[model samples]
Target: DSCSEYCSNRCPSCDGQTQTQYTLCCINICCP
Candidate 1:
């Protein structure tokens, strides 16, 4: 959830197949 509007680089890094999409998916939380 690269949505700086809500998340603002707060999400943690992930692994596995979803790694690339982890932060992008955490839109409501915010993850850089």
Candidate 2:
């Protein structure tokens, strides 16, 4: 879970899950 580690410092509350989700969101929008 590379995103897990990234979230540790960045989004302690959200654990950067938001980032992961949004990252996917961007990909979806761009690709779709």
Best by lDDT: 1
Worst 10 residues of 1 by lDDT: 8-17
Task: Put down candidate 2 lDDT per residue, 10-30, tens digits, no spaces.
Answer: 322332456667555344432
Task: Give the TM-scores of the predictions, in the order they appear.
Answer: 0.22, 0.32
lDDT of every predicted structure (CA atoms): 0.43, 0.41
lDDT of 1 by residue, 1-32 (tens): 23433464544433232644654456523443
Kindly give the stretch of ten consecutive residues in candidate 2 with the minimal lDDT sum: 6-15
Q: Count the backbone clashes (under 3 Å) in each candidate.
A: 7, 0
- The parts of candidate 1 lying over 4 Å away from their true place are 1-17, 28-32
Off by over 4 Å in 2: 1-17
With a 3 Å backbone cut-off (N, CA, C), the pairs that clash in candidate 1 are 1-23, 1-24, 1-26, 1-27, 7-30, 11-30, 11-31
Error of 1 at 12 (Å): 12
All candidates: CA RMSD (Å) = 5.8, 8.3
